[PDB]
């Protein structure tokens, strides 16, 4: 803390200069993304933006990386550090100061909405990756808000739900990754969640925010509310909140200025909170008078290359039978499935961005394979009932005032929408022309809320409203699009399409949606089976959509959308050498494993996914992924409750989530935590533990050079009603050529032996004999040793 002392001196001078009206103003938001500026003290407007896979800015493109679970499947916090560096470069370019990322809530249930956005079901692996990600983002002088503090491991009724979580459960599981990132990475900020934990809402939670996070862990950054989570001027200030950031009319500002002057809300409390915001201002560099934390920035990073590297390093090859992968030299390959032509690179929610261009599996494999590239056949379409209007749509974004007079025309990206306009703007048209690809009944819709008027070819097909009873307006926007009208358009012949939204009195975004005309599912699977029959290997890319996987709501089942499961079985029957490329962000049921030759989980693999998949399938590279979460059937899954009964979600499983819960119940999953295969064999030959330092020698006993994640699992020798049977206590990714041997000196944290004392309010190093085991997964433990926990 050498320059930090000088920096915190400039913060104190700035705090002293400001008056009560400016102090309360600063803590209140200005726009959807930025805070007010104060030239009286040389402070610029703090720009904040989403998020985990890419930086959006203020919608005025981004680099779309693979989903957060994909980054965690690489088991490499050095990759997460590099990922963070690129994101800081993106933020510096888009003028963003704070990145609203990473999400580190655990994978409690497989039905969780933002499951694709979290890293793992294990708090150690989550903390390690999160630590790397934050250190990397802040390495480029860009702030981070570790979201969603704490216990936001489900989306239904997230606005009000009371998540009743145990004392040990919070300390050992849900809070762990936050403590790990606070201590290791030193984050400049945090975000408090919409839900409540044991009574208090996270934004108003005095015990967890001020006493635990700040008091025990020594957090020195700012605490932003989740967008619309701030709901009390006095309740949030006293509960450790600093910034009510939903938008312009926040709970802070003039209501807070008044509460200080009139009520028993002390100006000392306001001063303590502004001090935190002004400390952030100095680190991100928006405050003149305090030098920025990172002055010399990290060397430029190639965004496309890192997106490909993270993508292939995460692909978990769970199944591979005799050797389906990699593909053989000069083999006839057939690509099947809609997800191969139109890939799903991002998951739904605020984490979405628009990349420059996306490489699809068919684009990638066409270039990778020679003359007579993959024979493509769409097997089934998962992206229905509706999808954003893009293919064949040439749209503009017209702004109108009260008199309907045009006051601007922005270029439409495709259908979504959010210049020299202001409170005068009354409505927003989204006109254009649409050339249909095939004749039939085209449906048109919208994903938005409020007043809408649709006119496909002059005729006003819709002119009504779209209200909803839900407690959260964010659930409403990213909900499935609503069909407004069916229309008969002949292919080739285009017509003038138009969708207007009237705006007046938070709510400010809509998108034109369109469904391609009817396609028989059974005939689609018939034409794909002919291609499966006409090939040495069939590659079926199966995927969950942004409508299935998204924020605001939870999934209903782990089954694949559309007739995709029925497509896989038809292809597996016609051709035995079938490779299923699962492009899903969360666990999904694989009922046809026994029939298919191979399975490869690719998550939502970012804009370069198609290039990484082409490299892996052809054998240019190896799939370097190892499950960061336990995959299995929903019936076998022991912790699935996402829905709150009587407005309460009890976490009855306690300290047992993910693999810990499967062990406690005897239920064995389809593929366990840490499972994954590459394109080479690994023989663990030596394990030496000295105190708490495990040293592992592993041999590449395969035909090709490859990577291996060494996974150390601690397990008490005695019975453990109080604890899980085994748990991850360390890991390390090593690379070696065939025959060559690599070592791994992995130190197990002191914490791996400790448990939480609810009464003392302290950690308890559990003494006794343990079994430290090195392996390829939890189920594939290769070598064991018995040690006494050191003093």
Residue numbers in the entry: 10 to 69, 74 to 335, 340 to 435, 444 to 530, 537 to 822
Task: Cite, word for word, the article reporting this structure.
In Streptomyces scabiei, the causative agent of common scab in root and tuber crops, a genetic compensation phenomenon safeguards the loss of the gene encoding the cello-oligosaccharide hydrolase BglC by awakening the expression of alternative beta-glucosidases. Here, we revealed that the BglC compensating enzyme BcpE2 was the GH3-family beta-glucosidase that displayed the highest reported substrate promiscuity and was able to release the glucose moiety of all tested types of plant-derived heterosides (aryl β-glucosides, monolignol glucosides, cyanogenic glucosides, anthocyanosides, and coumarin heterosides). The exceptional substrate promiscuity of BcpE2 provides microorganisms a versatile tool for scavenging glucose from plant-derived nutrients that widely vary in size and structure. In this work, we reported the structural and biochemical characterization of BcpE2, a GH3-family β-glucosidase of the common scab phytopathogen S. scabiei.
We obtained the crystallographic structure of BcpE2 at 3.09 Å. The crystal belongs to the P3121 space group with one molecule in the asymmetric unit. Six regions could not be built because of a lack of electron density: the first nine amino acids (AA), the 12 C-terminal residues, which consist of a His6-Tag and a linker, and four loops (residues 70 to 73, 336 to 339, 436 to 443 and 531 to 536). BcpE2 is monomeric and is made of four domains: an N-terminal (β/α)8 TIM barrel domain (residues 10 to 306), an (α/β)6-sandwich domain (residues 316 to 398 and 551 to 650), a PA14 domain (residues 404 to 548), and a C-terminal fibronectin type III-like (fn3) domain (residues 711 to 821). The active site of BcpE2 also included Asp59, Arg127, and three additional aromatic AAs, namely, Tyr207, Trp240, and Phe499, which were generally conserved in the closest GH3-family enzymes. The PA14 domain of BcpE2 was also characterized by B factor values significantly higher than the rest of the protein, particularly in the active site vicinity, indicating the likely flexibility of this domain. In BcpE2, Phe499 was equivalent when the two PA14 domains were superimposed independently (Cα 2 Å apart) but was shifted toward the position that the substrate would likely occupy when the entire structures were superimposed (Cα 5 Å apart). The BcpE2 structure revealed two features likely contributing to its broad substrate specificity, i.e., (i) a wide cavity in the PA14 domain connected to the d-glucose specific subsite (−1), and (ii) the high flexibility of this domain, especially the structure elements defining this cavity.
